[PDB]
Ligand binder design. Sequence first.
Ligand code: A1EKA
Lengths: 296, 257
Amino acid sequence: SKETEVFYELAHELPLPHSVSSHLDKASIMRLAISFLRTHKLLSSVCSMDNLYLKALEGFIAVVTQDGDMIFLSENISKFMGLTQVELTGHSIFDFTHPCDHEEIRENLTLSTERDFFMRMKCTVTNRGRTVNLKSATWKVLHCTGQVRVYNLSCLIIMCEPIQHPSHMDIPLDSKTFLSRHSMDMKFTYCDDRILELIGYHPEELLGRSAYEFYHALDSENMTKSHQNLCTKGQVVSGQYRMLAKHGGYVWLETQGTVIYNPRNLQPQCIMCVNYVLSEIEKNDVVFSMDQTESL
Amino acid sequence: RRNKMTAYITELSDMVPTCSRKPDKLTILRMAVSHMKSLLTDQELKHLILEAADGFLFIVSCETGRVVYVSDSVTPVLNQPQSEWFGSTLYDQVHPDDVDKLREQLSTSENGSRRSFICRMRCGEPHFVVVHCTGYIKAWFCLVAIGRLQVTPTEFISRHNIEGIFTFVDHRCVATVGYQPQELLGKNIVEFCHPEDQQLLRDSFQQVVKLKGQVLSVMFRFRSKTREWLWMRTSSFTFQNPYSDEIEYIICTNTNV
Ligand SMILES: O=S1(=O)N=C(Nc2ccccc2N2CCCC2)c2ccc(Cl)cc21
């Protein structure tokens, strides 16, 4: 039978390179075609320079279904997770994520349509670009933001971005981004000298201080949640928040946090923080905390 | 195994009416082939990005910041017409306090490279929205990027040590009690309470620490800058460090009653 060559032409007509399509088993071709058709259906619903859009992204796009089927993943996912598009499309998302998150994913696929969460996906790529296999896999925290929508049922379109590791930095950091180091209770223990010019604090006086005293109370609900995520998944991105400035006022910040471990005893040592100052000192006349008044 | 293959062929046929007496397997294979030949372009990807993260693409010049390309998506993210953006520089569309940072991100002195930053861009008395920009450089020197919008009185709140000293107080105090924040910080809250009520207040504090996490409640006469006794309800709970469970402080919401 020439059904093998019918599959050959099916894979060639599938939208991907020939070198990837022809090294494909039967059930894999069936999976790919089914998912492409269902993605086209939802795309007809939603819509009624490819390399530029793709390589300009700090993450990968994924549309998953209510039953958890990843009916489409963008090509760049490999660049971030190692696992490639053909290896993942058609499979259930629960077969690739940390089980300790599954319920949370289960609660973002259901049913306001906006979604913003953190999950842990399998990752077989290393910081060197070299790729290991499924049996030896590292968890990678992804920040997923998207919308759940209904077609004719439900599906979830989310961008998933990885959170850079402060040690393995690959992008430039500007004048108003600076590093900070904390214990796991978020108590300050190291900070960059840029904070003196940016917020007015001298690194030394912050050492040993709880960061919970230095943020505007209105943001507490965000911050604690981030801490909690940071302690359950090891990485987090905060929302925009206000850190009180030295001589009154505050400054707007967004910071990524990563739990870093000791390589020799594999215990968590401390937390890194890449802080993005988003403004200048606002309301510099108003004081809000005792640390500012004692500084008048 | 065989069941999975059969379900695969059927679900293939399931969504395609053209082939759906359901025919020989080979015929539905060539059927999917022919139906796909009739049919991933860039417009669907643009809408996928706009759906997922409310982002839009733009290409600017690394030297003069004049934008060489803005996608239509600029209109729903910022309510700003395409005609505005095209023909201008990013410095004009960015908050004036954010130009220097822009200057560095557009610099070619330091380093095919990748860029990722945050700024505030004005949308359609001005208003600015926070935008995360991720992109790379392209000779065309230019910056290709996607900018996205994440976007996800009668009382005043205060923080206290377990003793009752104001260690944090929000500005709304000046309207509720009449004091500037500086006259409250460093002083115990029982200093501003009517003596007849003071004991009650103290009890509540002892109760919020014994009953951690639980919110407690007390009503007392607070002295204002105008020296008037104003009745006030304070709902107080202790906050604990989510890692070590250490009590960071006590949060109170002092509400005029
Ligand atoms: O305003 S802070 O004093 N609080 C900070 N972080 C914080 C505080 C309480 C709970 C959670 C967090 N985060 C976990 C990771 C993101 C932030 C922080 C970080 C860096 C600087 Cl430079 C200043 C501050």
